[PDB]
Symmetry: T
Subunit: 141 residues, 12 copies
């Protein structure tokens, strides 16, 4: 049983340079945390990241064809992309929206999300652990 | 530590209506799962519901005093009450807002929350499990 | 059959202050008028008023359980309470929204109603007689 | 002892189409149903329908001129016409706005009425019986 | 079968603007062009124009009753009339909204339309040919 | 040297109600005052009234054709009719929006005009005399 | 009987750049024009211009003290100054708002006036002749 | 000469957290401070607080029945409660709304008050003293 | 201690007009009443009024150099001036906003103030005693 | 000769998911279909699809360079890309905006398009035939 | 060639408070620097500052008669004055808008400018040197 | 010092069309100009362009890692991309925003920037030379 964890724009740079606001864990450390929780829960996590929206669409397309669940942090594209939402509307397995930071306590534009109205649910502001809590939801389907 | 699980108005009527949106689990059955799960997490859950504001604020006053964390599902009051936001403002230990349903997939009015801005984080649309996923978060702050 | 007539905040003060707007009948005389009209229609009208939200939710709960009709005039809460709206969402029998003043003739905030969209119907500004017309609609289903 | 009942655009076609919205009754069937109830109340009821605004304003002037109460379902014009409002603001006797369907639970544009702030009162969503209920209000004024 | 082409207020005046917007063909030319083209697709086109909404409702009501397709250019009514839309909604064959100008390059008020949501489709900005294309669409039912 | 004075809906009933806002002059009196004034300015006025949009459409269409100027008091169609604006937009000769009451000092809805932006100029709040002040402007031009 | 005619900021510089929009007439010429015209109406116009809001309010104070009428073209202040509105609100004789150009067919912001709800009437888009028309209104009271 | 000092939700906890924005003073210190000034000014001060909208409404009812004036700091309910407002509207002696914090310097939502438009006057951001400054006002009616 | 009392545009007219709104006290009498109270509270009050924004700024700059407190009634400029706002933001000593009238019971636009979010606090609607209440607060810093 | 057909995000997966909207033809089959119709019109269609914004931009550049007309269905990019619109504005030959679904009959955000204001025309909701009607318009203009 | 540098309100207090974004130079030294660079650029720069709106518009008038160009930091009046905006619209020579601080990273109300839409361009956030870079643009014409 | 000059989508087409809202110069020439100018300043300019959001993010990433400043003209992305802004918030050297045309004199949507709130400063409407003024500022640090 495969779960896709896809991260969009700028999340390769986690831990790097600044914040504070996202944690000091790096993308590589997070990939490794996700795989460890995955195994504990008896699932295979496939974790990916890109700064390219097209690449992101391809990734969601394969999840849709594979009937596979998706934990998604679209990053910036969350509040901006209809193309990405239109792709997610094709998933028939669950979709969990994830935000590292509590997006409801920041700039007002971070409060809109094309993803929320079609996701199974959303997790916001629980640190990197949010990913791990999502996985565990998926583990109970 | 102790953790207070506070349920807002109507939530006493759980799983008698619209099993599709709010679950088939009754309120008692919920007290059950949360308590057990908190035991497994090595915490002690105190799980209470009320149809009344004063009551709610009072319970939140106590958690403040005790410097204990709160999982809050405030029901309809999530969307209307500054009194409750202000009581939750006192808390020095983490606050986690929960909603069984995906509020972003429903009436527009349900997408404004007074708590999201001052909560540590927010779990929406993952059903009943959302309470337990809040617990696991708290188990390591 | 039983027909609940539920009056929300301040409506107990019915009679003192500003007739013209909400007419010269006291609350006690209103109860009398209602039960009378109901009797001549074939119904038993239980008539109740409360300044307390929790109280009003409880009575809706009871009506919901019992599957009886409800005629509601929530006063202030019409414009502000989501908790109350949801409690009425439980009801499987008709729910008539009633206001004595024409709320469309007055301040802007009185023109918004959280109950209107889930009501079977709405009667506004036809004085205390607005209640009696609701009874009559119910007598014929 | 005369009451006027005026239906606007499209109400010629009382279904014809649809169900829980609008009648299963026809316009003729309504005219006669009104006159029955009217007669029963000791009132001559004058029921008229037009798809012409111009023609509706003219009926309204005559009611204005004779100081007779008016029951008005302006259909689409409710939400749109200032001219129809201006004509009605001339009525010295009572004006009751009736909508068959519950307009507050439909598209957003239906939730506005140029008539409501100047009507005596407003009945919404009680079906065809809403005309009859407006008749006995006037029976008492 | 038969196609109804319906033209609203001011469309009689086609040919007194010149220039961009509406073009130099006139309404008589238009009926001839539409009639030739249609019988060349093997349909018969009944093309009608009126400055009066009540007249336009009537002709819709007819199509509703006879179950014919309507190609509609509502002129200024497009932006203002709940009445027209409600009439159009009754139609059971295709309904195609047509605008000669690009209503999207013009005044903001012209950007809005009560017809679009309930139509099969909308052709805009393609000049006169727009009518002819909508016929061709109708040629494949 | 013809001037067209066109009076939209409800203006046929001037005189009786609200003489402190529209004057206590009837329409028949307004006709005489205008004619007598255009006479003395050496113009000929044609003063027409109608409650029908289609009828007004026609009268505007006619001045468009005769290149004759229009003083228009569209009454309630001022705030609602694009069809009306679009017909006036065809005039080559001057067009003057007239309003007897100070619309800016009244309901919010009365403050928007579809005519002002395409008009030569606009007179508001100067009573019946605003009609005659518009004649004087056109005489000087 | 003295009429006051106050011109706000930039109007000192009429004549140079435009018309249409503003005059080809200079402020000096306009003073003479008004003066000649008032004289053959039986009025003495006093005509003043100033870029200083202080200066302008002092003049409005003078006419409030003398109970004299005021024709006002306030320039940019028309859309911005509460201080100018409030000075004018003290006036017991009429106040006519005059704009040379049609403020309704230019930038959105020019369509809003702090002065209009408190004027007797407004005259817009009749060029300089707007001044003389206003005096004529005053001649009749 | 009795003056009622009524405090709303959470205000019982004054002085224990964020002492920089609300009192450094406790609720008891505040009752002491007020009765001292009440006495000093020749009044009686009755100071009650509550977390319950219903209890508060009850007290406004009492003052209203006794034509005693009210100083209200409704806290959270200031922004949310139409109920509370409607009860206050009933008072015949002065209503002075008080806030300890400067509500105009904080979250946007704190800048709406249902009480303000019905109050005699409002004191804000002057600390605990504001109550005492309100008393002196009442001592002069 | 010097306390500066600054009154803005149109304040030179207090007590000739709207005596229910702003009171029957003249500005001279207001000066003498403020000064008097100043002595009672052991301070000097320098009270000045100007219709001129520049003059008002120059005064506020001076209070800032001198590091003296300000009780400001800016009249009109309260809702419109960023210049004034920016001058008051330089005050190192307290700043109290005073309005005579209750600005929240009046026009919509009298609810906005550039001052309030930078004032120490605000007193509204308490009539002339409002300046004196501000004085007393200042007598404790 | 050369007409360009460009399809945006996700339209590679055409025919596959919601046939009732979108249709049952795959992309490959659309290409064939459009090349066929173009040949009968004496045209040559080049039909291209791509999830990448920059790729789509590159293609628009090429037709601008080549003065070729463009028929563009951008999917999600329709409502979000200024970049795409700006590319399209460079074009000198006609631009035709096509949407297979009626975009006015779904979520609100699908009702805004950055392309419509700069397009020659727009066809929406006429299924896959929209591409073909767009071709024929181009063959005639 | 001559160049006009015009500082509006509060700008005579440069260098007092604070650091950013104003930041450190007094207006005296500011004048000295500008004239320096200007000479180096081989220009003649006249640097004037005023708190008076009226005074400001005077200088703008002079510059327009001279056909000199203008660097303008209007301070508060950028956000509020249509008068200032209208006087700048007669400059035949270029008009550069300068802000010392970044208006976009500050309060919402600082983000609107009556000036921007009619300026040649706009320099923001680059501190005191922004004046300096604006000279350079003018240097190159 | 290295300074990165980053151009967004379509800027490759610079100077080829709509000269000069943007173009006289081409993109190649601009690189020439930026470089010569930079060298004369003792700076090294690296100038780069892309129509790809991801490709622009990547170059922003390289500037953050190298603590080099960025001059950015983001094209259409300026108004729409949160990914780009979030990437620019990592930067530790100055970020200057540059637009060739006056964005505030054009379509309403171009008056919005995700980049401005976080940029050191913004230069708009000074044509190509704005890049050169941004170089000069940086040379000052
Ligand atoms: O803004 C940065 C940044 C981080 C470190 C240093 C400098 C800037 C950044 C990077 C990646 C993702 C995200 C983002 C991540 C989120 O999706 C999240 O909270 O998980 C919220 C979303 O709105 C935002 O674009 C932000
Ligand atoms: O509206 C009902 C209802 C219940 C049973 C049958 C029919 C309606 C209801 C009841 C309790 C809580 C809640 C609510 C619970 C939520 O907090 C949630 O999804 O957990 C979302 C919140 O918006 C809502 O008031 C809703
Ligand atoms: O506001 C008063 C009041 C009483 C006495 C004197 C002055 C005002 C009051 C009291 C009870 C119910 C209600 C109300 C009742 C209504 O539901 C109604 O019309 O029945 C309309 C609703 O908007 C309002 O809150 C108002
Ligand atoms: O939509 C139709 C229709 C129904 C069957 C056949 C053809 C059209 C229709 C007709 C008359 C009135 C009305 C309408 C009537 C209402 O005034 C009403 O509820 O009575 C609400 C109002 O918003 C709507 O325009 C609708
Ligand atoms: O404004 C005129 C006019 C006519 C003849 C000469 C000069 C102007 C006019 C006439 C008919 C329809 C229309 C109109 C036609 C449209 O339906 C259309 O684009 O076909 C769009 C709509 O917004 C407008 O009312 C305009
Ligand atoms: O609303 C009435 C009415 C008349 C008498 C008694 C009661 C109401 C009415 C009648 C004719 C024209 C008008 C109107 C007249 C105006 O055009 C005008 O002031 O001339 C302003 C316009 O907004 C309104 O439709 C109103
Ligand atoms: O903006 C200019 C200008 C003049 C010549 C060349 C370029 C600009 C200007 C000057 C005087 C008065 C006025 C003004 C005068 C008006 O009051 C008017 O139309 O009378 C309308 C009002 O919105 C505007 O501020 C504008
Ligand atoms: O939010 C708190 C709090 C207390 C302690 C620690 C942290 C927050 C709180 C408590 C009582 C009243 C109030 C409030 C009281 C106010 O009425 C006031 O300033 O007096 C303004 C109003 O907007 C707010 O709800 C706030
Ligand atoms: O409009 C007059 C007036 C004066 C004397 C007689 C009649 C009217 C006026 C004068 C000074 C201040 C103010 C004003 C005073 C306020 O500052 C206030 O309520 O004190 C509110 C503010 O919005 C308004 O501009 C009004
Ligand atoms: O949203 C989906 C989807 C389809 C089936 C199943 C799940 C999602 C999707 C896919 C491709 C294009 C398009 C779209 C295509 C349209 O351009 C169109 O109607 O052609 C309208 C436009 O707003 C939308 O983005 C949507
Ligand atoms: O607000 C002050 C101040 C000075 C000291 C202490 C506190 C505030 C101030 C002074 C001069 C100009 C300016 C201003 C000038 C600006 O144009 C600018 O950035 O140059 C931005 C503009 O919005 C603001 O009004 C502000
Ligand atoms: O629209 C075109 C175009 C290109 C070539 C020929 C004709 C038009 C275009 C191209 C590049 C950048 C830009 C743009 C450039 C700006 O960033 C700018 O002025 O620097 C303003 C911004 O809003 C717009 O996206 C526009």
């Amino acid at each position: 049983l495969i779960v896709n964890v896809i991260n969009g724009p700028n999340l390769g740079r986690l831990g790097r340079r600044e914040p504070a606001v996202y944690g000091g864990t790096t993308h590589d450390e997070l990939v490794a945390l996700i795989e460890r929780e995955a195994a504990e829960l008896g699932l295979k996590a496939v974790v990916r990241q890109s700064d390219s929206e097209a690449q992101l669409l391809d990734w969601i397309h394969q999840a849709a064809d594979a009937a596979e669940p998706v934990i998604l942090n679209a990053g910036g594209l969350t509040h901006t992309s209809v193309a990405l939402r239109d792709a997610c509307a094709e998933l028939s397995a669950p979709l969990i929206e994830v935000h590292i930071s509590n997006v409801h306590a920041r700039e007002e534009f971070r409060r809109h999300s094309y993803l929320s109205p079609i996701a199974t649910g959303v997790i916001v502001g629980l640190g990197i652990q949010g990913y791990l809590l999502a996985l565990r939801y998926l583990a109970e389907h």
